[PDB]
Symmetry: D2
Subunit: 243 residues, 4 copies
């Protein structure tokens, strides 16, 4: 997370940390609890190649990473089949936990938007996570969960920005239709936030508009953050995740 700051402990009850087995269960990606037994994340965080579930764990809402670890095993990794790379698209995945979690004020699901929802450009949204606080710049210990207010941006406008200073032809799609974008040169998500959530308060309730996907660096000029548009894959998600 670039810009923004440490999050109050009562905020973002659905944020989660993905841990991979090594000298210690290390955080490699963010995620979100969208259902007592399901975690929404970014496909590249766990794909394209097949993974060994034995080496993966999910950590629910934690104020400071690693301090009060309570690792939860995963039973299934469902990576969207159209995924191969973040730039191409369909960068979204599902993690089924072996046991549902006992929700509470402190830890509970976030809500998916309805297939109609669109989130207008210049709409206040928040992205959260434990990622780098800047290009090649780790979040130092005690590893607090961070948050930043980032403005949504019209799909075509981000595509347009990504063509500036680039040899890529203007009519060649870079930011694709299954993507969403937010951020500026001051506020943005970075490495370590991947698979994390982008949420916006709509009519007084929180909806996940996106999943932290990719981008050319973090908060770079004319290089806004690119996210996997959630509304776009709701049908795929609901094929596994009960309504």
């Amino acid at each position: 997370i670039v810009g923004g700051q440490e999050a109050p402990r009562s905020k973002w009850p659905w944020q989660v940390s993905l841990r991979v087995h090594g000298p210690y269960w290390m955080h490699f990606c963010g995620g979100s609890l969208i259902h007592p037994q399901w975690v929404l994340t970014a496909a590249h965080c766990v794909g394209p190649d097949v993974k060994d579930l034995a080496a993966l764990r999910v950590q629910l809402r934690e104020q400071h990473l690693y301090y009060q670890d309570q690792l939860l095993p995963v039973s299934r990794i469902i990576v969207h089949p159209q995924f191969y790379t973040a730039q191409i698209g369909a960068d979204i995945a599902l993690l089924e936990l072996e046991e549902p979690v006992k929700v509470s004020s402190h830890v509970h699901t976030v809500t998916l938007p309805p297939a109609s929802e669109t989130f207008p450009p210049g709409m206040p949204c928040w992205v959260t996570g434990w990622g780098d606080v800047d290009n090649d710049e780790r979040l130092p210990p005690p590893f607090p969960l961070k948050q930043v207010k980032v403005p949504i941006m019209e799909n075509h406008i981000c595509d347009a920005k990504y063509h500036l200073g680039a040899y890529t032809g203007d009519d060649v799609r870079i930011v694709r239709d299954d993507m969403l974008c937010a951020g500026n040169t001051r506020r943005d998500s970075c490495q370590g936030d991947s698979g994390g959530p982008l949420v916006c308060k709509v009519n007084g309730t929180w909806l996940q508009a996106g999943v932290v996907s990719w981008g050319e660096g973090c908060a770079q000029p004319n290089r806004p953050g690119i996210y996997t548009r959630v509304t776009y894959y709701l049908d795929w998600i609901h094929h596994y995740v009960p309504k």
Copy 2:
């Protein structure tokens, strides 16, 4: 190059080394001379973002890197407008030297193939460069130009193998048509060879069939190397390079 030997002084007279400015003019990609004023290379070596031409130079064939440097300035960098990432495709580009080079037995251009050339399996080809000699293993000083004979396989054979051990649907094409496939777990090109040539001997003449592009690691099981299919972009090349 993985699984090769040091190349003799009389071979690959068209090989070139691209140099980036820094504490010293470091080698970051390969290339090939297709004309006294033009060099063929990979688009991901110089793009998708526009670079400062000043920080780039070209070194013509050397037996060992940095020892007999005679760096040459570049006046133009032309990247195929279709390019953005190597996996997507169109990983091809051109460089125009500020002056034409005097050709000879030790350094002359390579012949481009006719639009109808296929390069089918069985037919032996070679790939050259100064890249790593294995995953994460840099070429050791004095940095000799290496060569290796690589087996060519049909595009659909490689595509099917890139799906083995992957979540990507067998239906989603990975190895695209503007691409060419070669190598195995003992012979392959690695990081540092990108942009360099892949040549096959046809009717006694040497033809550049590909441009070192990408792959999942080097010489890895079920992940043969992927090269930009040169015949697919001939028309584009001729919009800049004389026939």
Copy 3:
């Protein structure tokens, strides 16, 4: 600490951590509270060259590094005038706090030994700290305080071992008189523990026998840990720390 276990919250009330300014107040060495206003540590941790005091801070006993920081500023760095390198000797130093500390059962001083105490082999001694759990292997987060019981051996026994597999002449002392040795190939202190305490229970009381100094690697064969012998420097310590 090498080959230990995580330490209980009620043990080692004198153990402290030294922090140096940077992206965050990072732990670089260990120490011990010997007086409400004084901290004992290794001279190599803060010298031989004079440092900017403002850039230094001291953290009192903590169960997990960085979790609950309450950094305390330092007004004076006092390094034994005889120190230059640890192998040579006099690897001892004093830190005076700008303010005295309020002691309790969780945070109190350690008892220094009487000038005549020896600590012969077969004595119960422990060494604590936040250092590496092995050679080039950092203590993984949440960074718990570790402890390990180390076997103490006579100086001449360690001096002879350091000579095995070495070109240094036998009559050329390596482990010097103002030094003490402990540990084996399974129990030792490592990088990061430097300056911390080595305590031994003697007749119901805990006494600081030495200060973690140096060694060739950690827990390496014939290379036991070497500590500055505290009894050797009582007179010096007392020219600053009131009796």
Copy 4:
């Protein structure tokens, strides 16, 4: 070498390069040819712990390291018995080649100074090597052999310099009698030059006055290069090396 330049092909015909086995025979220290079959160097380059000879080699005068390599095996490694660390002293050693090298105008021995010889402070001397061109920054490829003119300085005046900005007491020796110093904030030897020679032209003839040993950083303020004084160990060398 800091603040110097590439050496003319016909200077320092005695400079040598020490190679250690690994992915390739990498340079780790310098040395000098003092007899057709003996190489003078620093003990900290090959000790204090015993090394395996099969892993060591010797490369003679080379304009560019690694280019025209012709490694020579070493029959024996003689490390002064009083050596343990560079700061303590006796940082000198001898390498006995398996064969006598055939001297020539381009490759011959340097001369040892007479026991009574005293290089006056201010003496115009030269230090050669392939070490870093500055603190933490390697010598770029093609790795030319550098040289720099460094002024010798009085042993006492250096000891004093090293106490400035240091807690070490004034009457406590840092720069000892078996050492000598040279260089300033613009001219000095650096990591990789260790074991190399420090020659001075005396009465029309080159004498090796020092062996690159140690120092705090390279070219740092009030931290001149410290070298093992050769004259001091003439008797020890002649005990092995003929006349």
